[PDB]
Every structure is written in structure tokens, then in C-alpha cells.
Design a protein around this ligand. Sequence first.
Ligand SMILES: O=C1NC(=O)/C(=C/c2ccc(OCCc3cccs3)cc2)S1
Lengths: 261, 254
Amino acid sequence: ESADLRALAKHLYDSYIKSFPLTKAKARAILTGKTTDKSPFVIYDMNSLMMGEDKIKFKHEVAIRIFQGCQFRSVEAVQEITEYAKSIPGFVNLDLNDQVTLLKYGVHEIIYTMLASLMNKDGVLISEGQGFMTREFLKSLRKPFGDFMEPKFEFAVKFNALELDDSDLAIFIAVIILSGDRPGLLNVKPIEDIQDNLLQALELQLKLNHPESSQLFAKLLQKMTDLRQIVTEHVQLLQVIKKTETDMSLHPLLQEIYKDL
Amino acid sequence: ESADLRALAKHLYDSYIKSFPLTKAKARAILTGKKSPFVIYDMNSLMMGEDKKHIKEVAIRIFQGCQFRSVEAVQEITEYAKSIPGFVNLDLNDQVTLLKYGVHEIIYTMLASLMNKDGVLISEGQGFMTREFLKSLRKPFGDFMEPKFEFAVKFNALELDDSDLAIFIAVIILSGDRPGLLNVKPIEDIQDNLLQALELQLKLNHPESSQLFAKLLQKMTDLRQIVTEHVQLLQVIKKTETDHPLLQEIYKDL
Ligand SMILES: O=C1NC(=O)/C(=C/c2ccc(OCCc3cccs3)cc2)S1
């Protein structure tokens, strides 16, 4: 029944609003100058960086500080994604080892999917939308770190052209988590049973919410390819960073996810 | 309506049949199905294999044989592409770019048609090279074919036939995200037509296979990872087999 698929879509969106405090709708209102939401302080250079601590709530050399800010924010995102994952029907009923596997491989793909909501071609919201850091400033960071965000901006620019909203994205990230082709999965068939249902819900949602967007379903699914590539690029970059910066600490939670291979 | 889509589907199937001599249906007959192929499972059966055409060490020669055949397949794939409605009307640089960045993904998709969990057909179905033997090869040559095997067991589980694959091959070719494309719009416009035709095709041909369309598109992400892993390995070998002239030229890299 298409009715059961609408109710699932409604459940996932409601749980997505409950788990993720900075939605695409809030991010867009900040980025475009709406009266619903307030204006970000903009970090584009070192003085603006230093000025931002006075005006922005934080708790933080500059490339190292910025990169560890991103990783602390990533750790928080893993907390939110993990709470969203529990709400996807059937997920908590799976083999515990496979719940862990799905999270291990799913979480960064979702992080970079949702990061696109906070991006435009010029930069990225930070500190829950209170701040905005320009793309050029990030590209100017010392040698290595200078390229760590550019693959995220490039994808975001193409991803944001799909014009998805949070109700669309709620189902999409659920589809991402419940991939039965993740390495090391014990019981693939129950996982695939859930994804099948999630894919039907996503498909119906895209037809009703975007009835003039031809093959949006297929074009969104093709984007899954870009996410995989961003993750494997990021992992390579992290292997370099940790060799050139022996004094820089990665969070153990992210360190346990990065099993790659 | 759903009728122009059937035209597209049958047109592509027919051109696919003309363009690719060994189809999946025939490879299925040979493999796990009912002229049995000469099997290559060790060094002695390899040697007798060749004895009964490329031009030296065992592991190198097998890799060189894979190049010859893939260069053959690029020509089959190129001819098929020119049969996709609208492809020849695109910017010639863009046709070149779509083929350069697409033929690897298609080669490993069609190679899955010739594989099972235990080995791969070669020499137009006349031979079968066991997977275990390939994994047993020296240096990084034993790692060259293995990840295509793991893709192919996952791809083959979809149980696509040639009529399905004919439209999925075209979808891959018309990828609007290839680097360096000059005019992306008409490419995505064609691909959108192809995806529509692929979706109707799978719904009619596999009415019982829920969300087959989506599951097949998701296999793109594993294809590109395979291709990306492979071109890397391909570079490591540049630093194994070293200093051919016209031969080296013939096998540029694609
Ligand atoms: O080492 C790593 N591991 C990960 O999973 C990373 C992902 C990531 C998460 C958020 C990002 O936004 C930038 C926001 C901020 C800038 C300065 C203070 S806050 C950028 C990247 S980075």
C-alpha cells in the first residue's frame, strides 16, 4: 500500500527533526538572508578567525585547530546519526554486530550528505549556523590541510542542485544506513528487506514532493557514488595527516570507524 | 508514453546482440548450464592451453592477454555507443570523454556475465580460467582479478539478462559527471530517457523483483570503487614490467 509508505516517510521525517538540530531548512534560511533566522559571523581570514571567538560560542596553530573542530563536530554528528539510526523501523532488531557494521560504514556518507545542507559554493556554516567559514579560507590552509574540504564543496554544489528538502533527506540517509553490501555483514537478507521498503518510500516521496523532477530517484541514487569516493579520499588524506603531524590527536570514535579496507 | 521506451529498449538489445559476440545468455549456457570449455587451473594446464592471439613469465603474459581482450572490447563498446540514440549527435570531444571514462565500468560489468564464483570464461567461451589459479599469481598479479570476482558475485545476484544489461550499459556511457565534459545537458537528457527505459524494462521483465532498478543503480558505487582501485594497481605494475615500441603504443592504457 502506498499509504503504509507515506506513514513510514512521515515517521522518518519526524525522527529526523528530533535527532538533527540544524536542519537544511534552518541552514538555508540562514544562508539566504531570511527573517526567520539570524545572520552568521563570517570567517574569511585569520583576524576574522580570531574575532570569531568573541562572538561565536566555541572551546578552541590554526590549521590544526580548525581540523580538530571538524572532527569534534563529526563526533557529535555520529551521536545524532546513531540516534536517528535507532528510529529506523527494524534497525534495533538486527544482529548487534551488524548494527555496528552499518553505522561504521554509513556514518561518514551521511555526514557528507548532511554537510551539503550547510554549504553553498562559497563556504559552510559552522557552530550550529552562528558562524560561516569561506571556502577560500579553507583552501588557503597550510599545505596539506588546504585541500581537505574541497571534495566536500564540489559534491555539495552538485548535490544541492537536486533541491532536496529535509523530508526527502530523511528517507535518503535511512537508505544509506541500511546497505546490505557493507563488508562483514552477518545477515544480509533482513537488512535488504528493510532497505527495499525504505527505497519504495523514498521513491514515492520523490514523485509526490517533486512531480516535475524527472528521474530524481535515479539521480539521487547515483549520488551515492560520489559519497563513497569522498569518504575514500578523506581516509587517504587522514593517513597522510597522521604521519606528518605526529602531535595531532584523532578521536577514538572516529579512529574505530576508520577500519576502511 | 511507455511505447517510445519499448522502442529504445528493443533497439538497444538488438544493437547489443550485434555488437557483443559472446552474450550473457550464451555464457550462462557454457558456465553453470548445459562444447565444454578447456579449463585452466594450474601452470601445466595453462601451458597446454596456449598450445591448442597475443605473442616471458606466466603472470605477465596472463595480464597481457587481459589487455588484448579489453582492447578488443573497447571497440565493441564504441560501436555499441554510436547506436545509442543521440550519442553521435553530441560534441565529438564529449563522445571521446564518455568512452574514455566509461569503458572500464562497462568492461567489468560485462565481464561479470562471463564469471561465476569459481572462475571466468576466456577466448570467447572456449576456455575457463579458474579463480583460484588467478589468486595464486605472483607479486600483485594475483590481486588483479580478485575484486572483479567479488563484484561479479554481487552483481550476478541481480539475475539480469542481456535485455536488461543492454539498457544499463547505455546508462553508464551517458554519465554526465565525467571530467572535462563540454556540454553536460544533452548527455543527462539522453541518460534520463535511458533510465526511464531501464525502469520500465526491469518492471516488465522482473515484476517480482522489488526495487531492482534502485539496487542496480546502487551497484554503480561499487563499480567505480573497483575501477578506481584497479587503475591504481595498474600503475604499480608500470613499476614491475618495465623497458615493445608499437606494442606499448597499441596498449596505451584504456
Ligand atoms: O578528521 C575528520 N574526520 C571527519 O569525519 C571529518 C568531517 C567534517 C565534519 C564537519 C566539517 O565542517 C567544518 C566545521 C568547522 C570548522 C571549524 C570549527 S567547526 C568538516 C569536515 S574531519
